[PDB]
Nucleic acid binder design. Structure first.
Length: 220
DNA sequence: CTTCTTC
């Protein structure tokens, strides 16, 4: 009856291995276990300088509203891009960019690379002023006017791209990226667009961070 | 996994 057969026994021949060792890693964590010595340093100086102004608990809920404010923003964009939200400062801030968005092909949709073996969750694949791109919407309290102000956002964007131009669940491909940074006070958002060549150069930088991850784990 | 925090 069975049509494809593999052997139960191996013709070649206190373990307590955890389940997650074999899970396909995610795009974000691959990046978080590959941060530079200076990047981990700069963020920790920020956490400890924070907790001193707000106490161990005040910061703990400062973290809660940042995450939630992000949450509601993405719930807002899914309602507006599924085929009072206009009083949100973040939506006030993206309203101009958002009128440039049509042809939505995916919202909050998971992506998997079979050969490169990582997963991710794309914000949205839509047309922005005609160019079909992977879009990453992001909240921020400080302005991020240049793309190098967004830190690792370029590399996750290109990580979502090249992984979804091979994910079998997508018939189409994409060759551009867009990071949109929305601010709480309502001032206009900063679009950071990434044409095909600039996604190519970050894609190179992302393949380096993927090798660091596979290295650090194999010994560990 | 995300949602963010470095500059």
């Amino acid at each position: 009856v069975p049509q494809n057969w593999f052997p139960i026994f191996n013709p070649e021949r206190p373990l307590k291995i955890p389940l997650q060792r074999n899970v396909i890693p995610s795009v974000t964590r691959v990046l978080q276990q590959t941060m530079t010595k200076q990047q981990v340093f700069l963020l920790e100086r920020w956490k400890q300088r924070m907790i001193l102004e707000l106490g161990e608990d005040g910061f703990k809920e400062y973290t809660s509203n940042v995450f939630l404010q992000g949450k509601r923003f993405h719930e807002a964009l899914e309602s507006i891009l599924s085929p009072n939200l206009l009083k949100s400062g973040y939506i006030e801030s993206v309203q101009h960019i958002l009128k440039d968005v049509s042809g939505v092909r995916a919202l909050e949709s998971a992506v998997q690379h079979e050969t490169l073996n990582y997963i991710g969750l794309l914000d949205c694949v839509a047309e922005y002023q005609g160019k079909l791109c992977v879009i990453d919407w992001k909240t921020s309290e400080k302005p991020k006017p240049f793309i190098q102000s967004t830190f690792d956002n370029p590399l996750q964007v290109v990580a979502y791209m090249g992984a979804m131009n091979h994910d079998t669940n997508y018939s189409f491909q994409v060759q551009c990226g867009l990071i949109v940074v929305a601010y709480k006070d309502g001032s206009p958002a900063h679009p950071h667009f990434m044409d095909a060549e600039l996604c190519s150069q970050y894609w190179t930088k992302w393949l380096l961070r993927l090798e660091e991850y596979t290295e650090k784990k194999k010994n560990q």
